Symmetry: C7
């Protein structure tokens, strides 16, 4: 049931995790809404098998035509549509996976050092190596390149998704039906068989609507991703550390005091 | 079995969690009651395939017509009805997700500071920075804007749901049946085929009743949500903190003593 | 298998938890016995499709008539019977959920204070604020209103269930069969189709027996619920706290000694 | 597979837990052996649909007759047989559930006090309130009434099971077949339909054997339950506490020494 | 897949646990190999329904004949064969369950006392109540009676299994086919129906081979069980305690030293 | 999906655990690749039922012939092939199970003693009973007999597997088809039935390839097993302890120092 | 649903773990995308059974031809394609498994020693055996041989995959159809049967696209694997330890300080 999907979701900067969780989670959700669960009914294609065709002859036409999709461009998309959404899902996850593997371990070690030293600064203020170290990160653009690349690849893939979905949704209405033919090889010569079988890719009607839903959300997601490039308003690694430091304020025992002190004073 | 649904539910202010758990949990429940489990029987559409149609020709009509729904407005709704309830479920969860990600971390850090300092006030009373800090939150409307927006979006979405469900329920009875036709493309010319196939969206009868159930609960849920706007009776951030402080009284070791002392004295 | 149901059950005052666990658990069990597992066999309706009808034409009649139930009152009940039992299950759980969310947190904080102070009284007896506090709860009717309302709503819903089940069981035997017709819209004019199809709601025979089982248990459950209103024999909040204190005697380290001392002395 | 059943079992006095685990576990096992797993094959009824009947007309007869069971006493039993075994299973569990909820909490608190004081007696013997308390339980028949009632209800239900199973097994062989008729309402007049359909409740052959198995085990279980009434050989509450004390000897650190000392001396 | 069976096994004296794990685990395995997984194909019986019989008439014959097995002895066995192996599995587990419930708690308490005192003897040897206690167990035959009975019942049941399996395997080849007839009651008179239907209990071919496998393993298991009776070579309870003490040498911290000391010295 | 198989594996000396994990894991994998998952399609046998045979008559032939396999040697193998691979899997696991139960507990107790004493030797070297004990194990061949037997039985079973698989693979291509006949008993006389039905054991084509895969891996596994017999190059128990000591060097805190000291010095 | 696949992945040097997780995870993913989930529809082959063939005769052709694939090279591949991808998956995992079992335990013990001694060097620097030991690893090529072999086998298998996939993808389009014949043995002579049946390996169209996807990723993966051979830019074991030391910098408490000190200074 759909609840077994929704509860699988209802029950690394925060906005970028949200962007990724949307960017990846939605198409995986939509695929699970599209090809799976009972709205899809029993089959993906069916065709006017003649009344003379046996139950398996008719099933042979339907299954042959499901291959014959690849032998026209919208039909090719309409068949592979779940995998194409999955491909976008994977391609949107990879920036976060690359971030996790290539950038997050350095940032983790740096932030943990920074936070502990800043708590020492507060302890000593009650009672500058870290500042010089931070002022050295001020003279660096290594980790921000990784971050920008992750945001930029996400932005590019989202645009490719929006382009693909806009094209797909616009073309879908014209082309959920096609004129298959089983007449090939030897049995091309079979006079008992119609020259072409009309077939409907029954799932295309679902994919059309859900492509629009995916397009709308990604069209909403583009400006949120674009906003990530406004880094100094949110271009040196220190600015990225500062943003992650502002994120990790939850851990700054000192800041929980010092911000209250500042806010009153 | 339905118990596998009900036990999935039977076994952030409290009222707002209740509102959200109702607002989101019910449609997910109703979808799982509607399209899933054996009350739905074997298929979503079926049609008068002529007695001359083969078992798969008849299945082709049923499956073609399940696409032909989209080629009339009630039929379009009747097909997508599970996803539309799911859409409302997601749109009702998002206020709480936004609250969790955008408001709850600030509030958590603030409340934990406030509660500890108030326990210190009690300890010192046995044996004003926090008050000045609270009196500073008295001069703020930042977090209450987030809260009001969450309540307001929930209210708006619930009204959109109530409007949609009222419309759907009112129209449903007229329009669970429709006159499909497979006659398209080449086989539009097939003289052996009826010009139109009468079809019934068999699930619509379930969706009709369950839309009314969802409407009634949301009609009950509207005033509970509206009551959330009566904040000073329950418009400055301090009032929101006060309400969350009154919520977190479970944690106020001092209050468990001080309220007994007050209540006796 | 039924063991996967029974073991899901075989493997907040106690009597009220028992009442709730019965009141909610039984219909969820009965639904899982009724519509689910192999006693239900393959389908919920079937009808005399003419011998001229195709396998899918016959399936179309059965599935159409499963919708046509709603187009007569017993048939409407007979279709929705699982959801109506589920509705009673939810409506019987809500008193306990309301109790858990609206009454139990106050009572928890109160009882934990009371129990600790009473252990101090025993410790001091070895070696009156709590009594004055309890004598203040003696002058209150706030929490007992919540309790009475929970018991009263449970009682009301159980009576509504007993009324519904008595009516349903009494009517069921007359009305598991009905005279469907697919003749509607265009194909109302189809001369090849019988004017009406006789159909049997095959599951009704199970629902009849299980409604009686549910009725009998709830008829047994009514006096147990009624007994809950005899509060001073078991009308001020202190009496409710006293009953919950008598419940929580398991926690009263002092009472485990003091009752032995009293019982000997 | 049957191993998924058997391993669910293969992988409160002990004898009474054994009795209950048998009394409840066996019918739940037998039901899972009876109506479930592949020995049951595909269907519960089938009937001589005429060769003129369609595949769904024939399925309509089978499913109609599965309802027509209730419209003769052995047929009524033969249909509901799984639920009747389940009913016995629940009715045999309830004594233990009642024991767990109504008697075990008092007994737990009493035994834990008794055992600790008896360890103190041993500690003081190395280096009488509990005896006077026990001699007070010697003047009581409260908890033994609960115990006797649990044993007596179990005994009664087991006898009712043995009576039912003996009757069912004895009658089963005569009555796994019956002469259904679909001829009712309008289509009572259908000349194309046989006046009666012969049907076999195919599962009855399994239920017959398994009823005998259940009967034999319960016939073995009766004397074990009867033995529970020989309390003073195993009628005052102290005797019940003594038996539970003899059970809990596993916890008596002193007895592990004192019994060795006694056994040598 | 078979791996989901094998990994359920691949991934109380040791030899007796091995014997029990074989004696019980193998038939449960074989049943899961026999009636379950795809080697069994789609059905347990099928019969020469005449070409005039409908698909459900033919299914009615097959399912009727699956009941008619019980209306000839090999057929009766061939149907119930899974439950008969399961019956042996349960009857082989019961000795170990009886051992666990009736003998192991005494033995556990005794061994734990014995082992601790023997470690004290070693500690005092570095720096006789237990010996007198053991020499008292030397004058006892209580627990060894329980053990012998467990081994003897296991031996008896294994022989009954070997007898049954030898008989079944020897007879199986003759009698996987039988001449059913549906001609009973009213439709005994149906001239359109053959006087008898030839049927094959298709699974019998699997049960034949697997009965031989079970027989061979149990024939191997008999002497291992018989070896258990050679107790003084492995008739007073001390000898049983000695064997369990030799088993629990893993726990004897002293023996890990003392045996090295002995082995060198 | 195959990933649910592969991840079940992708996600006691080491080489012997590897050998066992291969020897047992591969056939269990191959069976799960062979008879299970969608490559196997819908059925194991099918046959030329005449066009006059009903759908169930044709299913009766297929299912009868699945039994008639046993009424020719390659057909007998081709049917039981999954169980024969499983039999090899179990027979290859038993050496490791026997090792775990019969040899590993002694070895565990010995190694743990040895390792602790060798750490004491290092501690005393910083600041010979174990050597004399080891020099006593030098005069023993008890545990190495168990080890050799485990390796030898594994080697024997692997050769029996390689022989069986080589034979099976070589014969498979000739004999995936056979000439069944249902003509037996009464209906041997049925003139409407062909004297023989040609059948194909459709799965044999998969078993052929996978038998070669199993053969190749086991042919690779033979020399690895043979290498295990080169014990003194890797015949007294000390040599086995030495090999297990070299294995457990991971635990030798001293060796982690002493080997560095040795390697530098 | 595809989300149940993707979330199984979305939710030993790092680059080599990434390479392995890609190299192994992708084909397992693609197989689960290819042969499994609803895009594959109901069957792998179907064929032009004549209209005279029964539903099971037609199923017999389809299933016979699924065997007849092996009685032409592309057809043989097209059938076994899932197992061939799985074979590559296993063959790509084995380098990492061999690394885990044969190289990682030595490296683990070495690194843990090295890291602790380097922390001692820092502690002593606040307040050369390890250097001499490392300079001894400088004179070794044992572990780097294992590493190079793991990288080289991975590279070889990836090239074999790329070769296979390039060939398969290039040939696939020509050869998803083939001219089966059931005419063999006795029924070779059946005049009612066509001399050849045209069949389509319906899944080949999916395998074609997914082979290209696998090829593209592995073509991307080749240079990443090739880069692993540039060891001294990333040929003595010390260089491998240095790379693993640079990996384990996350553990070097000293380096977290010393690198900050170095970076500032």
């Amino acid at each position: 049931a759909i609840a077994h999907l929704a509860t699988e979701y209802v029950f690394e900067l925060a906005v970028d995790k949200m962007v990724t969780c949307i960017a990846v989670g939605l198409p995986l959700l939509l695929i699970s809404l599209a090809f799976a669960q009972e709205i899809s009914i029993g089959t993906q294609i069916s065709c006017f098998s003649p009344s003379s065709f046996s139950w398996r002859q008719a099933a042979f036409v339907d299954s042959y035509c499901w291959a014959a999709v690849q032998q026209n461009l919208p039909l090719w998309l309409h068949k592979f549509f779940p995998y194409i959404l999955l491909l976008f899902a994977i391609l949107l996850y990879l920036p976060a996976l690359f971030w996790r593997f290539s950038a997050a371990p350095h940032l983790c070690s740096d932030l943990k050092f920074i936070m502990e030293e800043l708590d020492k600064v507060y302890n000593r203020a009650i009672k500058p190596i870290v500042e010089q170290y931070l002022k050295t990160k001020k003279n660096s653009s290594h980790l921000i390149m990784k971050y920008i690349s992750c945001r930029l690849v996400t932005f590019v893939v989202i645009l490719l998704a929006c382009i693909y979905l806009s094209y797909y949704f616009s073309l879908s209405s014209l082309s959920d039906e096609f004129l298959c033919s089983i007449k090939s090889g030897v049995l091309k010569n079979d006079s008992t068989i119609p020259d072409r079988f009309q077939c409907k890719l029954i799932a295309v009607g679902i994919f059309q609507l859900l492509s629009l839903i995916n397009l709308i959300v990604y069209a909403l997601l583009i400006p949120v991703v674009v906003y990530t490039f406004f880094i100094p308003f949110r271009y040196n690694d220190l600015s990225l550390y500062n943003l992650f430091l502002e994120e990790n304020i939850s851990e700054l025992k000192s800041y929980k005091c010092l911000k209250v002190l500042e806010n009153i004073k």
